[PDB]
């Protein structure tokens, strides 16, 4: 299925929208103002994850690794750098929050490796 | 690869002694590096305005609590240097700052957190001299004095308010000007 995102008109930088090639029966992207237009890359017009299957890793950030208010474990060495000290916390996202699943981040600078087990 | 930098520059020398203390004086205390002479004196011509009590508050602290030093020649012409401030160490390890006859507390604290260093610039470089290790913190004693009451305003250091001396018949001033 993939994931379509916003595209801006090279002419006016306004958002580009999909349009079908009524003749060749294909998908086009066109600016709603100027006739700026290009051929579409996804063949998918839209997607809506009802289950909210999500890569929590995208919203997790390594900067949290230095949060002093975060619990640390010497029990889980970093899978990347092997460092013993790692911070652990839950995925605060509605479906991830309902799942209460834990995320671990390395307490080592420039490593910041974040994983779930 | 080791980048080789060979350079010729004059050395600037500092006599750092045994102990080095960093000092930032609060707004009610100050220090003057020029030797104090009534002639060529700093143009501190504040009073001719016939100042209000906020102005006299700042003026009183500025005039009376500014630490100065001077070169004095004896009858033989030998130069004796006099300063109006001096620091005293006590048997219990405490310290105090003396500004003439008045006495102020001095508490010793080592400099935690701030990495403040003294360097001297020569051309494109800086030559290190020292890192500040301990600082001096001051607080006034002598609570019986009236000067302690007004110092509360000193933090006030666009226009700022003034205090008239409670003088004038103001009701009469109102009544008469409205005629």
């Amino acid at each position: 299925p993939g994931f379509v995102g916003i595209r801006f008109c090279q002419e006016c930088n306004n958002m580009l929208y999909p349009k079908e090639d009524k003749e060749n029966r294909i998908l086009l992207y066109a600016c709603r103002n100027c006739d700026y237009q290009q051929e579409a890359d996804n063949s998918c017009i839209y997607v809506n994850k009802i289950t909210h299957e999500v890569d929590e890793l995208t919203q997790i950030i390594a900067d949290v690794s230095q949060d002093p208010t975060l619990p640390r474990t010497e029990d889980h060495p970093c899978q990347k750098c092997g460092h013993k000290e790692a911070v652990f916390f839950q995925s605060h996202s509605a479906r991830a929050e309902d799942a209460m699943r834990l995320y671990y981040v390395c307490t080592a600078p420039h490593c910041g490796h974040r994983w779930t087990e | 690869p080791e980048t080789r930098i060979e350079v010729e520059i004059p050395k600037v020398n500092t006599d750092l002694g045994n102990d080095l203390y960093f000092v930032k004086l609060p707004n009610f205390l100050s220090v003057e590096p020029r030797p104090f002479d009534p002639q060529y004196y700093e143009d501190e011509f504040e009073d001719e305005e016939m100042l209000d009590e906020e102005g006299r508050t700042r003026l009183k602290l500025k005039v009376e609590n500014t630490i100065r030093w001077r070169i004095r020649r004896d009858e033989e012409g030998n130069e004796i240097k006099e300063s109006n401030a001096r620091i005293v160490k006590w048997s219990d390890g405490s310290m105090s700052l003396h500004l003439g006859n008045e006495v102020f507390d001095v508490y010793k604290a080592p400099l935690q957190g701030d990495h403040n260093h003294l360097f001297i610039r020569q051309g494109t470089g800086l030559q290190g001299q020292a890192v500040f290790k301990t600082k001096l913190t001051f607080r006034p004693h002598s609570t019986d004095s009236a000067t302690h009451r007004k110092m509360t305003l000193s933090l006030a250091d666009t226009q700022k308010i003034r205090i008239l001396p409670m003088a004038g018949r103001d009701p009469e001033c109102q009544r008469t000007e409205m005629i």
């Binding site: - | 226009q159 003034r162 205090i163 008239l164 001396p165 009469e172 009544r175």
Partner: protein
Amino acid sequence: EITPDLWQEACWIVISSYFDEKGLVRQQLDSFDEFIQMSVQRIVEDAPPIDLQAEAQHASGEVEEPPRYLLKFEQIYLSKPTHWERDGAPSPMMPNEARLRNLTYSAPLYVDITKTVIKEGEEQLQTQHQKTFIGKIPIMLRSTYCLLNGLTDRDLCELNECPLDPGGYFI
């Protein structure tokens, strides 16, 4: 460092020092003093200077360029609490005097005003009226602008006042 045995002593000694340092109404005293010291002046200059133009009488039979008067407020002054007897004779207004005489513990406010008149391109004569009297503002008790400011224990009771009063209220 401080042992557990001395940490309890250290803890209440530190708190005692805080109560030596800051009283219980420090934020109020500070706010009123800041109101007097900064906000009141800020409010004074924050006003736009007045530009008034005389209504054309058209008495000249032509479209007149009426003379216009301009005013700008400058320096601000605040006296200490002053009580004027019925005769306007100024005397120090003590909080207890204001309390017994049902007076308002306030100090008169003065402001420097530059008056101005601008007659077209023809000469204009900007003039000034200094230390003009504005209303009287009540002072928050024990603020720096009070008369019982920094006053010692001997003085306050001599002023028939309580030395332990934190202040922070108006009369």
